[PDB]
JSON list of C-alpha atoms in Angstrom, two decimals:
[
{"chain": "G", "resi": 1, "resn": "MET", "atom": "CA", "xyz": [68.02, -203.74, 90.05]},
{"chain": "G", "resi": 2, "resn": "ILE", "atom": "CA", "xyz": [71.30, -203.58, 88.16]},
{"chain": "G", "resi": 3, "resn": "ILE", "atom": "CA", "xyz": [74.31, -201.61, 89.38]},
{"chain": "G", "resi": 4, "resn": "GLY", "atom": "CA", "xyz": [77.04, -200.05, 87.29]},
{"chain": "G", "resi": 5, "resn": "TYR", "atom": "CA", "xyz": [80.19, -198.04, 88.04]},
{"chain": "G", "resi": 6, "resn": "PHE", "atom": "CA", "xyz": [82.07, -195.43, 86.01]},
{"chain": "G", "resi": 7, "resn": "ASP", "atom": "CA", "xyz": [85.47, -193.75, 86.26]},
{"chain": "G", "resi": 8, "resn": "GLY", "atom": "CA", "xyz": [87.67, -191.41, 84.29]},
{"chain": "G", "resi": 9, "resn": "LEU", "atom": "CA", "xyz": [91.25, -190.14, 84.50]},
{"chain": "G", "resi": 10, "resn": "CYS", "atom": "CA", "xyz": [93.48, -187.61, 82.78]},
{"chain": "G", "resi": 11, "resn": "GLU", "atom": "CA", "xyz": [97.24, -188.07, 83.17]},
{"chain": "G", "resi": 12, "resn": "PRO", "atom": "CA", "xyz": [99.99, -187.04, 83.50]},
{"chain": "G", "resi": 13, "resn": "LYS", "atom": "CA", "xyz": [98.54, -183.53, 83.51]},
{"chain": "G", "resi": 14, "resn": "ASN", "atom": "CA", "xyz": [95.11, -181.94, 83.63]},
{"chain": "G", "resi": 15, "resn": "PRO", "atom": "CA", "xyz": [94.24, -180.42, 81.34]},
{"chain": "G", "resi": 16, "resn": "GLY", "atom": "CA", "xyz": [96.36, -181.50, 78.39]},
{"chain": "G", "resi": 17, "resn": "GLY", "atom": "CA", "xyz": [96.95, -185.15, 79.18]},
{"chain": "G", "resi": 18, "resn": "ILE", "atom": "CA", "xyz": [95.45, -188.46, 78.11]},
{"chain": "G", "resi": 19, "resn": "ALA", "atom": "CA", "xyz": [91.80, -188.73, 79.12]},
{"chain": "G", "resi": 20, "resn": "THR", "atom": "CA", "xyz": [90.43, -192.25, 79.36]},
{"chain": "G", "resi": 21, "resn": "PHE", "atom": "CA", "xyz": [87.55, -193.89, 81.17]},
{"chain": "G", "resi": 22, "resn": "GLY", "atom": "CA", "xyz": [86.21, -197.20, 82.37]},
{"chain": "G", "resi": 23, "resn": "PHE", "atom": "CA", "xyz": [82.94, -198.74, 83.42]},
{"chain": "G", "resi": 24, "resn": "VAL", "atom": "CA", "xyz": [81.44, -201.97, 84.69]},
{"chain": "G", "resi": 25, "resn": "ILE", "atom": "CA", "xyz": [77.93, -203.41, 84.79]},
{"chain": "G", "resi": 26, "resn": "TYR", "atom": "CA", "xyz": [77.01, -206.20, 87.20]},
{"chain": "G", "resi": 27, "resn": "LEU", "atom": "CA", "xyz": [74.35, -208.58, 85.91]},
{"chain": "G", "resi": 28, "resn": "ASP", "atom": "CA", "xyz": [72.90, -211.63, 87.69]},
{"chain": "G", "resi": 29, "resn": "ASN", "atom": "CA", "xyz": [75.84, -213.92, 86.88]},
{"chain": "G", "resi": 30, "resn": "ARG", "atom": "CA", "xyz": [77.94, -211.87, 84.48]},
{"chain": "G", "resi": 31, "resn": "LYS", "atom": "CA", "xyz": [80.13, -208.78, 84.63]},
{"chain": "G", "resi": 32, "resn": "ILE", "atom": "CA", "xyz": [80.36, -206.42, 81.64]},
{"chain": "G", "resi": 33, "resn": "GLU", "atom": "CA", "xyz": [83.54, -204.36, 81.35]},
{"chain": "G", "resi": 34, "resn": "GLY", "atom": "CA", "xyz": [84.31, -201.41, 79.12]},
{"chain": "G", "resi": 35, "resn": "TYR", "atom": "CA", "xyz": [86.62, -198.45, 78.65]},
{"chain": "G", "resi": 36, "resn": "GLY", "atom": "CA", "xyz": [87.74, -195.91, 76.09]},
{"chain": "G", "resi": 37, "resn": "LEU", "atom": "CA", "xyz": [89.41, -192.65, 75.06]},
{"chain": "G", "resi": 38, "resn": "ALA", "atom": "CA", "xyz": [87.52, -189.40, 75.74]},
{"chain": "G", "resi": 39, "resn": "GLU", "atom": "CA", "xyz": [89.50, -186.83, 73.76]},
{"chain": "G", "resi": 40, "resn": "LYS", "atom": "CA", "xyz": [92.59, -186.32, 71.60]},
{"chain": "G", "resi": 41, "resn": "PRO", "atom": "CA", "xyz": [95.70, -187.31, 73.60]},
{"chain": "G", "resi": 42, "resn": "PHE", "atom": "CA", "xyz": [97.53, -184.33, 75.07]},
{"chain": "G", "resi": 43, "resn": "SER", "atom": "CA", "xyz": [94.85, -181.99, 73.75]},
{"chain": "G", "resi": 44, "resn": "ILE", "atom": "CA", "xyz": [93.89, -178.85, 75.68]},
{"chain": "G", "resi": 45, "resn": "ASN", "atom": "CA", "xyz": [90.37, -180.29, 75.73]},
{"chain": "G", "resi": 46, "resn": "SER", "atom": "CA", "xyz": [91.53, -183.40, 77.60]},
{"chain": "G", "resi": 47, "resn": "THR", "atom": "CA", "xyz": [90.53, -183.09, 81.25]},
{"chain": "G", "resi": 48, "resn": "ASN", "atom": "CA", "xyz": [89.63, -185.33, 84.16]},
{"chain": "G", "resi": 49, "resn": "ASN", "atom": "CA", "xyz": [85.98, -184.24, 84.19]},
{"chain": "G", "resi": 50, "resn": "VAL", "atom": "CA", "xyz": [85.66, -184.81, 80.44]},
{"chain": "G", "resi": 51, "resn": "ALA", "atom": "CA", "xyz": [86.98, -188.33, 81.00]},
{"chain": "G", "resi": 52, "resn": "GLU", "atom": "CA", "xyz": [84.59, -188.97, 83.89]},
{"chain": "G", "resi": 53, "resn": "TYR", "atom": "CA", "xyz": [81.57, -187.70, 81.95]},
{"chain": "G", "resi": 54, "resn": "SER", "atom": "CA", "xyz": [82.58, -189.88, 79.02]},
{"chain": "G", "resi": 55, "resn": "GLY", "atom": "CA", "xyz": [82.75, -192.96, 81.23]},
{"chain": "G", "resi": 56, "resn": "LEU", "atom": "CA", "xyz": [79.31, -192.13, 82.62]},
{"chain": "G", "resi": 57, "resn": "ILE", "atom": "CA", "xyz": [77.90, -191.69, 79.12]},
{"chain": "G", "resi": 58, "resn": "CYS", "atom": "CA", "xyz": [79.39, -194.93, 77.79]},
{"chain": "G", "resi": 59, "resn": "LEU", "atom": "CA", "xyz": [78.06, -196.79, 80.82]},
{"chain": "G", "resi": 60, "resn": "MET", "atom": "CA", "xyz": [74.54, -195.49, 80.31]},
{"chain": "G", "resi": 61, "resn": "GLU", "atom": "CA", "xyz": [74.54, -195.90, 76.53]},
{"chain": "G", "resi": 62, "resn": "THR", "atom": "CA", "xyz": [75.54, -199.53, 77.05]},
{"chain": "G", "resi": 63, "resn": "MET", "atom": "CA", "xyz": [72.78, -200.05, 79.61]},
{"chain": "G", "resi": 64, "resn": "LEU", "atom": "CA", "xyz": [70.21, -198.53, 77.24]},
{"chain": "G", "resi": 65, "resn": "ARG", "atom": "CA", "xyz": [71.37, -200.73, 74.35]},
{"chain": "G", "resi": 66, "resn": "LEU", "atom": "CA", "xyz": [71.04, -203.80, 76.58]},
{"chain": "G", "resi": 67, "resn": "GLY", "atom": "CA", "xyz": [67.54, -202.89, 77.68]},
{"chain": "G", "resi": 68, "resn": "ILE", "atom": "CA", "xyz": [68.41, -202.21, 81.32]},
{"chain": "G", "resi": 69, "resn": "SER", "atom": "CA", "xyz": [66.04, -199.92, 83.20]},
{"chain": "G", "resi": 70, "resn": "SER", "atom": "CA", "xyz": [66.07, -198.06, 86.53]},
{"chain": "G", "resi": 71, "resn": "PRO", "atom": "CA", "xyz": [69.72, -198.89, 87.24]},
{"chain": "G", "resi": 72, "resn": "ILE", "atom": "CA", "xyz": [71.89, -197.59, 90.06]},
{"chain": "G", "resi": 73, "resn": "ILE", "atom": "CA", "xyz": [75.04, -195.81, 88.83]},
{"chain": "G", "resi": 74, "resn": "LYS", "atom": "CA", "xyz": [77.99, -195.27, 91.15]},
{"chain": "G", "resi": 75, "resn": "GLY", "atom": "CA", "xyz": [81.16, -193.23, 90.76]},
{"chain": "G", "resi": 76, "resn": "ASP", "atom": "CA", "xyz": [83.71, -191.39, 92.89]},
{"chain": "G", "resi": 77, "resn": "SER", "atom": "CA", "xyz": [83.47, -188.15, 90.90]},
{"chain": "G", "resi": 78, "resn": "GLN", "atom": "CA", "xyz": [81.38, -185.97, 93.22]},
{"chain": "G", "resi": 79, "resn": "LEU", "atom": "CA", "xyz": [81.67, -183.19, 90.64]},
{"chain": "G", "resi": 80, "resn": "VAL", "atom": "CA", "xyz": [79.93, -185.19, 87.92]},
{"chain": "G", "resi": 81, "resn": "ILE", "atom": "CA", "xyz": [77.36, -186.69, 90.28]},
{"chain": "G", "resi": 82, "resn": "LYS", "atom": "CA", "xyz": [76.37, -183.35, 91.81]},
{"chain": "G", "resi": 83, "resn": "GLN", "atom": "CA", "xyz": [76.03, -181.71, 88.40]},
{"chain": "G", "resi": 84, "resn": "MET", "atom": "CA", "xyz": [73.95, -184.63, 87.16]},
{"chain": "G", "resi": 85, "resn": "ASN", "atom": "CA", "xyz": [71.71, -184.50, 90.23]},
{"chain": "G", "resi": 86, "resn": "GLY", "atom": "CA", "xyz": [71.17, -180.76, 89.87]},
{"chain": "G", "resi": 87, "resn": "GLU", "atom": "CA", "xyz": [73.21, -179.50, 92.84]},
{"chain": "G", "resi": 88, "resn": "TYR", "atom": "CA", "xyz": [76.04, -177.94, 90.78]},
{"chain": "G", "resi": 89, "resn": "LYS", "atom": "CA", "xyz": [75.56, -175.87, 87.64]},
{"chain": "G", "resi": 90, "resn": "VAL", "atom": "CA", "xyz": [77.26, -176.68, 84.35]},
{"chain": "G", "resi": 91, "resn": "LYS", "atom": "CA", "xyz": [78.99, -173.83, 82.51]},
{"chain": "G", "resi": 92, "resn": "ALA", "atom": "CA", "xyz": [82.21, -175.30, 81.08]},
{"chain": "G", "resi": 93, "resn": "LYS", "atom": "CA", "xyz": [81.75, -175.15, 77.30]},
{"chain": "G", "resi": 94, "resn": "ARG", "atom": "CA", "xyz": [83.39, -178.55, 76.78]},
{"chain": "G", "resi": 95, "resn": "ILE", "atom": "CA", "xyz": [81.29, -180.08, 79.56]},
{"chain": "G", "resi": 96, "resn": "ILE", "atom": "CA", "xyz": [77.91, -178.70, 78.46]},
{"chain": "G", "resi": 97, "resn": "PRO", "atom": "CA", "xyz": [77.47, -181.14, 75.53]},
{"chain": "G", "resi": 98, "resn": "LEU", "atom": "CA", "xyz": [78.51, -184.12, 77.66]},
{"chain": "G", "resi": 99, "resn": "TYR", "atom": "CA", "xyz": [76.18, -183.09, 80.47]},
{"chain": "G", "resi": 100, "resn": "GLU", "atom": "CA", "xyz": [73.20, -182.65, 78.15]},
{"chain": "G", "resi": 101, "resn": "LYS", "atom": "CA", "xyz": [73.77, -186.06, 76.58]},
{"chain": "G", "resi": 102, "resn": "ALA", "atom": "CA", "xyz": [74.18, -187.69, 79.99]},
{"chain": "G", "resi": 103, "resn": "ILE", "atom": "CA", "xyz": [70.97, -186.05, 81.23]},
{"chain": "G", "resi": 104, "resn": "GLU", "atom": "CA", "xyz": [68.92, -187.45, 78.35]},
{"chain": "G", "resi": 105, "resn": "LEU", "atom": "CA", "xyz": [70.31, -190.92, 78.99]},
{"chain": "G", "resi": 106, "resn": "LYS", "atom": "CA", "xyz": [69.64, -190.62, 82.72]},
{"chain": "G", "resi": 107, "resn": "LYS", "atom": "CA", "xyz": [66.00, -189.79, 81.97]},
{"chain": "G", "resi": 108, "resn": "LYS", "atom": "CA", "xyz": [65.58, -192.57, 79.41]},
{"chain": "G", "resi": 109, "resn": "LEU", "atom": "CA", "xyz": [66.99, -195.07, 81.90]},
{"chain": "G", "resi": 110, "resn": "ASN", "atom": "CA", "xyz": [65.42, -193.52, 84.99]},
{"chain": "G", "resi": 111, "resn": "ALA", "atom": "CA", "xyz": [68.87, -194.05, 86.50]},
{"chain": "G", "resi": 112, "resn": "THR", "atom": "CA", "xyz": [69.88, -192.96, 89.98]},
{"chain": "G", "resi": 113, "resn": "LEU", "atom": "CA", "xyz": [73.42, -191.64, 90.46]},
{"chain": "G", "resi": 114, "resn": "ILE", "atom": "CA", "xyz": [75.17, -192.18, 93.80]},
{"chain": "G", "resi": 115, "resn": "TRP", "atom": "CA", "xyz": [78.61, -191.09, 94.98]},
{"chain": "G", "resi": 116, "resn": "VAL", "atom": "CA", "xyz": [81.02, -193.59, 96.51]},
{"chain": "G", "resi": 117, "resn": "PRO", "atom": "CA", "xyz": [84.57, -193.10, 97.84]},
{"chain": "G", "resi": 118, "resn": "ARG", "atom": "CA", "xyz": [87.53, -193.75, 95.55]},
{"chain": "G", "resi": 119, "resn": "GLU", "atom": "CA", "xyz": [88.31, -196.98, 97.43]},
{"chain": "G", "resi": 120, "resn": "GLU", "atom": "CA", "xyz": [84.97, -198.39, 96.29]},
{"chain": "G", "resi": 121, "resn": "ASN", "atom": "CA", "xyz": [85.46, -197.65, 92.60]},
{"chain": "G", "resi": 122, "resn": "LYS", "atom": "CA", "xyz": [88.68, -199.59, 91.96]},
{"chain": "G", "resi": 123, "resn": "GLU", "atom": "CA", "xyz": [87.13, -201.79, 89.26]},
{"chain": "G", "resi": 124, "resn": "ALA", "atom": "CA", "xyz": [86.26, -198.92, 86.94]},
{"chain": "G", "resi": 125, "resn": "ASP", "atom": "CA", "xyz": [89.58, -197.25, 87.83]},
{"chain": "G", "resi": 126, "resn": "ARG", "atom": "CA", "xyz": [91.42, -200.39, 86.71]},
{"chain": "G", "resi": 127, "resn": "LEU", "atom": "CA", "xyz": [89.62, -200.25, 83.37]},
{"chain": "G", "resi": 128, "resn": "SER", "atom": "CA", "xyz": [90.43, -196.55, 82.87]},
{"chain": "G", "resi": 129, "resn": "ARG", "atom": "CA", "xyz": [94.10, -197.44, 83.35]},
{"chain": "G", "resi": 130, "resn": "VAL", "atom": "CA", "xyz": [93.86, -200.29, 80.86]},
{"chain": "G", "resi": 131, "resn": "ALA", "atom": "CA", "xyz": [92.64, -197.81, 78.24]},
{"chain": "G", "resi": 132, "resn": "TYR", "atom": "CA", "xyz": [95.33, -195.32, 79.28]},
{"chain": "G", "resi": 133, "resn": "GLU", "atom": "CA", "xyz": [98.05, -197.90, 78.63]},
{"chain": "G", "resi": 134, "resn": "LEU", "atom": "CA", "xyz": [96.54, -198.85, 75.28]},
{"chain": "G", "resi": 135, "resn": "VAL", "atom": "CA", "xyz": [96.60, -195.20, 74.24]},
{"chain": "G", "resi": 136, "resn": "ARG", "atom": "CA", "xyz": [100.30, -194.94, 75.09]},
{"chain": "G", "resi": 137, "resn": "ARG", "atom": "CA", "xyz": [100.88, -198.05, 72.96]},
{"chain": "G", "resi": 138, "resn": "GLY", "atom": "CA", "xyz": [98.98, -196.60, 70.01]},
{"chain": "G", "resi": 139, "resn": "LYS", "atom": "CA", "xyz": [96.39, -199.35, 70.37]},
{"chain": "G", "resi": 140, "resn": "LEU", "atom": "CA", "xyz": [93.57, -196.96, 71.30]},
{"chain": "G", "resi": 141, "resn": "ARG", "atom": "CA", "xyz": [93.27, -193.83, 69.17]},
{"chain": "G", "resi": 142, "resn": "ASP", "atom": "CA", "xyz": [89.56, -193.25, 68.52]},
{"chain": "G", "resi": 143, "resn": "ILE", "atom": "CA", "xyz": [87.15, -191.40, 70.79]},
{"chain": "G", "resi": 144, "resn": "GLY", "atom": "CA", "xyz": [84.35, -193.79, 71.68]},
{"chain": "G", "resi": 145, "resn": "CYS", "atom": "CA", "xyz": [83.10, -196.64, 73.86]},
{"chain": "G", "resi": 146, "resn": "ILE", "atom": "CA", "xyz": [84.73, -200.06, 73.93]},
{"chain": "G", "resi": 147, "resn": "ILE", "atom": "CA", "xyz": [82.94, -203.05, 75.46]},
{"chain": "G", "resi": 148, "resn": "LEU", "atom": "CA", "xyz": [84.89, -206.24, 76.14]},
{"chain": "G", "resi": 149, "resn": "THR", "atom": "CA", "xyz": [83.30, -209.48, 74.96]}
]
């Protein structure tokens, strides 16, 4: 089985800050890293949960594109994980579309989502920060997934 991690952040304020994300996929002898921007910088729609859902979505879309199946997905966002696993309801208008897309990917991948403490998700956190810094430098300005070669 393959394991992947996802993270998202929104600084310096939430909502209304810069929302970026990061993810990592661990293959047999290779590590795939990615990150990105989740919403317009300093937009009212920019929130931590939007960033976290976006990281989850990019992680799963990448796994699907690669042909990975039945993976284990880990993250420290209990909010996202509990909504995805059906314990928490989703009503936030901005979250609804992200949740529905994530659910379809989860089903297509037959992925299992598991929560881990923040101290165990430092890799994906590092990537979210990389994207954050690129946004501040004007080097990241499109909403979408970025996968490092």
